[PDB]
């Protein structure tokens, strides 16, 4: 379903917005996860250029730039 598919996600910050924050943050705190930000919703809360439209090229340049280390 739409709710079941939207529940599963890579970014913890994006999951923390819509779903239960106490459960998502506590689970993401246990296993050492890290949001390598490709998503739109997670990037919006941080206050940066969204990976779509006028951005995209900036995100793609930064994504290719993060191949060195």
């Amino acid at each position: 379903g739409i709710t079941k598919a939207s529940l599963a996600t890579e970014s913890f910050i994006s999951a923390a917005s819509f779903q239960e924050t106490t459960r998502v943050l506590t689970e993401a705190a246990v296993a050492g996860k890290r949001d390598e930000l490709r998503g739109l919703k997670e990037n919006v809360i941080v206050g940066r250029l969204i990976p779509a439209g006028t951005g995209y090229a900036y995100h793609q340049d930064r994504m290719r730039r993060r191949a060195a280390g």
């Binding site: 919006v44 206050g47 940066r48 969204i50 779509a52 439209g53 006028t54 951005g55």
Partner: peptide, 14 residues
Amino acid sequence: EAYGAAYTLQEMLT
């Protein structure tokens, strides 16, 4: 987000 105004959304947010 639908229109793709990243600079407008970035300026309005921060």
